[PDB]
Amino acid sequence: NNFYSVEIGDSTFTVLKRYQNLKPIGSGAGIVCAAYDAILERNVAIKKLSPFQNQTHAKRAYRELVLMKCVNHKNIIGLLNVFTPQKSLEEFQDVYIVMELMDANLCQVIQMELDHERMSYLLYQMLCGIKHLHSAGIIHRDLKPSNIVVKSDCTLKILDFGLARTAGTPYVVTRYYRAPEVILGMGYKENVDLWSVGCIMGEMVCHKILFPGRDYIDQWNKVIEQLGTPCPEFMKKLQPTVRTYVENRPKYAGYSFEKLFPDVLFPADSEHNKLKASQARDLLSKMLVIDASKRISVDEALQHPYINVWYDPSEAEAPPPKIPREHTIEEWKELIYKEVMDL
């Protein structure tokens, strides 16, 4: 057989013979291994979608597969190969995705003391990845440090495309990174992603989660205590039921960004470049805005003095990815299989 089985913890990894020396790197709710591609003479990451058990997983796996092939960008994780051990549609069970192997999570970077140049450059690349997805009207929706991978040369790529979709109107976004429009059930546009960037940027500066809500409702308490109760113009935009609860909350003044992010928490202003704590804080104050209509866009974030120094139109103005929604599990299984065989 062209394949072979190797146990990783408890689950079985039935991969192509070309992929050798499989080692576990990360966990999910898909298990990821680091391997060596004997044919390509390079290190790879192999994700086993543990995929069509229910209609939710099916849409998540289909989205991941379709978007991974269409998107071709420096700051998006690239698809190298897709395969299945099974030989028929009836046999079909497991889906394996082969990608470029990165050295770490952004969790490790949050436990590091960076200089302005590395923070800025990491954020710039993140924004390039997000701008690319948005140029095709795709919103990531689940940006968090475990979805952001980095290399020792300070390069970065975005990872999860399971929830990635167009602008719309349940609990699938990770709590701490949920924007007010996701927490409060409003409609979300592209800049929902900028709130996630602000939470990640704040985590990098403070080295702790920015809004550590204890549940999905306490998440709102954490945001209004730090930022202040939103103004009545934002309240009018809420559904009457959510609005009554939000207006019933105790009133918060919030804290200034100078008190939330003092100079001492940012890297020292280098004598060798023009990057400054006051610009990083200004950028944070434009991303961590509750009302999405008053919060900046990805483009405005790329134009920001803390980020624009790296601007390169080859990465920042790259052509949009060319993309060519309710089915049963049987219709989905058939749909996944057709895409696996095609690529």
């Binding site: 050295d103 770490a104 490790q108 970077v109 590091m112 140049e117 590395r118 450059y121 980095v150 290399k151 020792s152 040369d153 300070c154 790296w310 390169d312």
Partner: peptide, 10 residues
């Protein structure tokens, strides 16, 4: 131009 930066990753 493309920078020459490093992250000490364990």
């Amino acid at each position: 131009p493309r920078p020459t930066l490093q992250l000490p990753l364990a």
